[PDB]
Symmetry: D2
């Protein structure tokens, strides 16, 4: 109809722009030049739209897409309207089953590149040449909730990477915590059923705060390690860009000589580690249930590409038994103070998808998708995972040919004797559909193992024992890793952990379940146990108070790599600041604030009590991003209030509340000139306090103080001060 506005304002600029600045859009419309080989091979299935006639699926042009065919304009719909019928039919079949676990996820395209050849330890082609680029597709996710639940729940996050190598798809399907809850895959369905919504009423969504989770945990102490991690701030990351990633299981690297090495896979966030605080995370599920999805997407459109360093913990075959814990036990971490992570390569995520359904929702990852140069181990959880995935994927995607869906295909077409199945797209021409054959001179052919481009051979690990359904006795230790984790956290991290356990156990209706969790916490650490106990109105028995603590892990009293914050790794590029305007902002302060933010790659959003524009003292017209209520403090990393007619907003409940919520959630607050009248709102002494930047104006110094606070992410020293303000 030519409904677009005459001005071109409906379509974003195909260049990197700041979050909130332009309508977001499909990846290849937004960043047409961001390319790689996999992204280039997808061009054959991308479809355009502009300037085409509207058609049926069979190519017939549609004249009237507003009406059904009927006998009279007020008469009955006629069965012969095939156009109406195809439209409703497709719509009626849009949905597919969501993943059993990790149904909520957000994904992006990018590339990986190794720093140096790793040929001495692995013949994996993607690790052999630093001038070589392997396209990747990453999907991050939550675990428990549906595809439509909230992003910022407390939970473990999945972190799956598909590597389209030259010798096959390698999928590195890991999580954001280095261990899992259970030891043997046989218990996956019991554990997952316990954390998922309870069967009689399907409640609660996206939460482990319910009886069944804690019943299970209280009966299966192998779970306490990963439960500590989830109860901590690790359970509620600030963003997918600011969390670690782990393969979890011990795998094998295999070189050209046949030497096998043990490896654990790590991803280090180049943006540093950072998480929200519980009240903030919970509230954020209400105000913006898509916060992680949006943030990841907008980060990529702004050019703040999520960057991660692939790292390896390497353990020679001869040191297999040299630890306190079993290397093949997935509830056990390998302390970096014992086995350091070696830097291997870098992954950059620089393009969003075009169609979430087509690329994200249909993407299929599998930990069994390994390439020559890698191999498994006998880890019993990994071993049972090797059976799931493909199984579930055919159910979910419609057939065994789901490897032909565009996102899932290798960069080089495969050749084998597999035929038919639902929705077969390739048309095979080989005369032979079996091997060995003589009618196609045996093609395609087997390829011996070799140093490069050889066929897949499993490592000839020795196998010895009886056929038994038995847990290895070396896996029977459950409290020493949870304790190592506990001792490595800072004091404010310990309290957050205490509050995580306290909050969750309080949603457990059956009191005895709470008491049993407390009993288990008393086997990890007495100080942890007493503080949780106290929050539940429980007193430990004398016996509980004398439980002897678990042994150290290989003599360690702590390991600082396990804390999010003990060792500062801050980075503010990509963070965002809220700027509370008034109806006559001193433009001098605004100019100084925005330019300083911009120099460090920090984003800003101009907020007011209404939408539209406000005009600064010199006549500068300032466009408003969102209102105070519309873009709450939960969504920003810090707040700045410029001088101006402060009386315009000083009595605005939403304005004041904005600073109270941000102060409560430990965020840096900066007040310029008369904005300092808000100090009374958050009870700040005349003197001032650490975490509150204030001055007569927003000069250079003022912005450097604010940015330094931003580099340390939150104002932990404010904790005792927040207790009292009602917010």
């Amino acid at each position: 109809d030519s409904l677009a506005p005459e001005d071109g304002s409906h379509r974003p600029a195909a260049e990197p722009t700041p979050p909130g600045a332009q309508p977001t859009a499909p990846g290849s419309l937004k960043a047409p030049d961001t390319r790689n080989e996999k992204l280039n091979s997808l061009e054959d299935v991308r479809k355009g739209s502009e300037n085409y006639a509207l058609t049926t699926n069979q190519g017939v042009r549609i004249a009237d897409d507003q009406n059904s065919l009927r006998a009279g304009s007020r008469g009955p719909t006629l069965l012969e309207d095939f156009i109406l019928r195809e439209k409703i039919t497709h719509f009626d079949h849009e949905r597919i089953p969501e993943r059993i676990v990790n149904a909520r996820g957000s994904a992006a395209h990018g590339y990986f590149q190794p720093y140096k050849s790793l040929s001495d330890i692995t013949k994996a082609d993607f690790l052999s040449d630093p001038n070589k680029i392997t396209p990747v597709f990453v999907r991050f996710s939550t675990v428990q909730g549906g595809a439509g639940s909230a992003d910022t729940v407390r939970d473990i996050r999945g972190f799956a990477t598909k590597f389209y190598t030259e010798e096959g798809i390698f999928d590195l399907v890991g999580n954001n915590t280095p261990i899992f809850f259970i030891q043997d895959a046989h218990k996956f369905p019991d554990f997952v059923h316990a954390v998922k919504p309870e069967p009689h009423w399907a409640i609660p969504q996206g939460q482990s705060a319910h009886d069944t989770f804690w019943d299970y945990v209280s009966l299966q102490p192998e779970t306490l390690h990963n439960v500590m991690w989830a109860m901590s701030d690790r359970g509620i990351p600030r963003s997918y860009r600011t969390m670690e990633g782990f393969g979890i299981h011990t795998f094998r690297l295999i070189n050209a000589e046949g030497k096998a090495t043990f490896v654990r896979f790590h991803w280090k966030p180049l943006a540093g580690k950072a998480s929200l605080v519980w009240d903030e995370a919970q509230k954020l599920t209400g105000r913006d249930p898509d916060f992680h999805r949006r943030e990841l997407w907008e980060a990529i459109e702004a050019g703040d590409f999520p960057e991660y360093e692939l790292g390896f913990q390497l353990i020679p075959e001869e040191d297999e038994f040299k630890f306190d814990f079993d290397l093949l036990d997935p509830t056990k971490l390998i302390p970096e103070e014992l086995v350091p992570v070696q830097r291997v390569g870098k992954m950059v995520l620089n393009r969003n998808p075009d169609n979430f359904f087509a690329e994200n929702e249909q993407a299929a990852f599998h930990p069994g998708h390994i390439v020559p140069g890698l191999d498994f181990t006998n880890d019993p959880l990994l071993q049972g995972r090797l059976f799931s995935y493909t199984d579930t994927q055919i159910s979910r995607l419609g057939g065994p040919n789901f490897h032909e869906i565009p996102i899932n295909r290798p960069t080089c077409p495969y050749h084998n004797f597999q035929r038919d199945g639902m929705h077969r797209m390739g048309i095979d021409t080989n005369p032979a559909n079996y091997e060995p054959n003589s009618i196609n001179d045996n093609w395609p052919r087997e390829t011996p193992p070799g140093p490069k481009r050889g066929g897949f051979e499993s490592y000839q690990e020795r196998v010895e024992g009886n056929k038994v359904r038995e847990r290895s006795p070396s896996f029977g230790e459950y409290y020493s890793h949870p304790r190592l984790f506990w001792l490595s956290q800072t004091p404010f991290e310990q309290r957050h952990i205490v509050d995580g356990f306290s909050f969750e156990l309080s949603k457990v209706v059956r009191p005895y379940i709470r008491e049993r969790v407390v009993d288990q916490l008393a086997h990890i650490d007495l100080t942890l146990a007493q503080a949780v106990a106290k929050n539940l109105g429980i007193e430990l028995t004398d016996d509980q108070l004398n439980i002897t603590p678990p042994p150290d892990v290989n003599g360690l009293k702590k390991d600082p790599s396990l804390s999010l914050y003990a060792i500062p790794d801050g980075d503010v590029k990509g963070r965002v600041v809220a700027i509370l305007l008034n109806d006559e902002v001193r433009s001098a302060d605004l100019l100084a604030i925005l330019k300083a933010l911009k120099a460090k790659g920090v984003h800003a959003k101009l907020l007011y009590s209404r939408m539209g524009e406000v005009t600064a003292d010199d006549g500068t017209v300032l466009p408003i991003a969102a209102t105070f209520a519309g873009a709450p403090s939960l969504t920003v990393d810090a707040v700045i209030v410029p001088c101006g007619n402060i009386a315009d907003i000083a009595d605005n409940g939403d304005a004041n509340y904005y600073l109270m919520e941000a102060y409560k959630h430990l965020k840096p607050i900066a007040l310029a000139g008369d904005a300092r009248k808000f100090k009374a709102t958050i009870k700040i002494a005349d003197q001032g306090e650490e975490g509150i930047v204030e001055a007569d104006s927003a000069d250079g110094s003022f912005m450097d103080e604010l940015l330094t606070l931003m580099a340390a992410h939150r104002v932990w020293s404010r904790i005792p001060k927040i207790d009292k303000i009602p917010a």
Copy 2:
């Protein structure tokens, strides 16, 4: 490896070769230069094989495809064998549901072209110019049987054509008889359940000769007309090349002025019409159940392209009620005496598929797929057909994106706002997935109806009446069309119809049902009635004898276009002759025989009592295509026995039976020199018999009498003489 023979005799030549000369092969390897737009756009999905490494579906190379992974070479299979599991999994899911009806079918690629422009009567783009070449994909099929049943059963045949036009797909989904068994689609599941295998035990396959079929026919006299056609020789085609094709329903052609014309579609075989005889047909379901599928594929590989003339019966709107039957009643035909068929264009099938499953099994046809220039009518069977197809196709193929399976795709990409669904291949980039929208400037957009390239508009037919579940009174006449068909058949064709009803009714267990059918035949024609009654040991009653025959159809009393044979139209090109050899063949006859057959494009198969070769009297070395028992006479159109050492085979029971069988089935037999010794086996008088070529040697003249007989297909005058042939 190198399993193929060093001579290179595993590969068939990429040139037209006669039936059984070379191993058959996928169309693209057999005839790589036979092309059309559709065939060329499928090129992006065709896969090679030669010279490729064997890989998983993820592209990982397989070293050993002979063995499962185990703990020790005599041990248990390990769950971690992802190669085995991938291979078994895909194998586990190969099969998809067969079509509910017309499961058994054979298909080929080709092209259509009009003879002249039809723009005075339709704006359909494919009919607009004789230079407009339209790619087609045709699927011929039986109706009742499963995907694995026999080709030469007695049954109706389906004849489906997919036209890939420049304005969308138009599927012409017809049968090989001009009417259907029932009038309203409400009864399709009742009719089909009655003809299909009975529910308690699932017998019988591919046969209407059981009680439920004949019970339903006896209780539903609307069925009698198509029943007549099925029981005639029309029900047992020689081949898909030698049968007619019909759309059955009256449709509409709409021109650019908006004028509507009623039309019925015809497909006229340029190879002419030909059918087997019942016992040959039933015997052939056991010696070669794939006969028709085989013959179609090999005709094409030989360059004997199946060719059909598209024909239209055109009826002015104003003539709607000018006949003594309803135009909209699908159990009524339109005699070509009353409304002649106008030749409109020709279709040629010239290329077999590459993979049966991918292109034939997954093909989807819909009578509802029409294009501007065409429209429906109120025919109640066609109307209800538009509630089916799509629905069934989504459960067979697996999803609402089956239009994206390569064979089903329109030549040019479609644009609409439909999204997702299982196995979505298209990656959409439109910022808008709805309309109207301003964010993509309302694209893709509607297009008004017009002369060419316009959107679809239904002809505005007036609808008047009450919402009722009621049969039109005009449709209640069930006997005059069956009688017209009966009076138009030759006397041997009449006799074949009697035998069909008699044979079928003999298999009905409940005698009362046999009598109810005979009672129906008495309403059609007394002679047919008595003849069937007599074969069942039934005596017509007094009352049945005085039944007045139904009225003539618009004065007609026969219509030679309804008979298969009344008007000679045979074609010998592509037929096959069996040549019975001996160890001392007279090479003077072979050359002459082969020189004469090849001049009229008749193929030959050299048959002996063992395989390998025989040596001619002059030393010519003859390769044997098959044995007498391996390639029985049922598979040829005529049998020739050249002179030589007849003593070598005169006492061969297989040789003698071959001629007795060919004789009984009315096929031409040629006997040279001492071959006239075989006359005794088929008891032929010394002066000879019309239909038995005999001469002193196989000269030109002898070959000419053989070719002339073959042009007449079968020797109808031998019928009375086969009675006393124990074969």
Copy 3:
């Protein structure tokens, strides 16, 4: 309504009758007194028909099952005809994928009874008591052909028995020859692809007589033992009642003490062994493609019950 004949000859006698005397019927109407534990528990799902009104799937009675709803008796069919839509819709979805292998098969219900207690060698509840009977469900089949293929082809036959024991279902999934064609399950799809119809033209149905099968056999000599049996008259049995059956693999019997014993399972036809000859078998696929299915069902209706040891 009065469609059945007045004499009542539309209905088969509910008693053992010989082949072709009466129209065959569903077992429970043919032999209502026949019973076993599994046949009795299938009762809650069986449905009658006589004297019931015709209804939709939601229980709405149907008045006119002959016509679609339209605007005028000659007018267009309306989308609001929910009775027509349901009927066509269920019809449209009737078929399911056939089995990958063994798609063509015939089955029947029955019972098993051990001659004596086997507790010395196995703790299996179904072999512990001679007065204890186990309901079974057996399906015989060919291997290569589709569900609509012919019975008397030359092929191996499947012999599968479902034991409904008191401690769980035990399925004995065997064949009518004591060995299989291949050694490692990894090659099953290769082998099966070779015997099945060749990929380009989907020919030939229900036959191993084509190039790919013999090619595979010639390159894989492990197949020659089962090939020998298939090329013999074992490949074309007279009936499923007159062929042997085998588990093929060595399994294990475990007693209460934990003592293992190697075992191979066998089925002996009390009717003895009998096969057709090649030409009779091939012509039969043309004259009666359902010969073995018919024969089995008819033997049961006649009281000539398939018996196996």
Copy 4:
């Protein structure tokens, strides 16, 4: 049918009518009912046409649509009164 898995979704417990339904529809994925009707079509004489159509009436009758008069041309048009 796509969501729940087949045309027999009326047989999932929660969806079943209180009184058994009877018709000639057969098969489909996950068929729970075991039909014993000798006939799977109508009209049939082998089960004396059961189950049968029931004429409409005041109580317990077959479904009959109201006979609304239909008048107009086949159009893809919004009624102007809806505007």
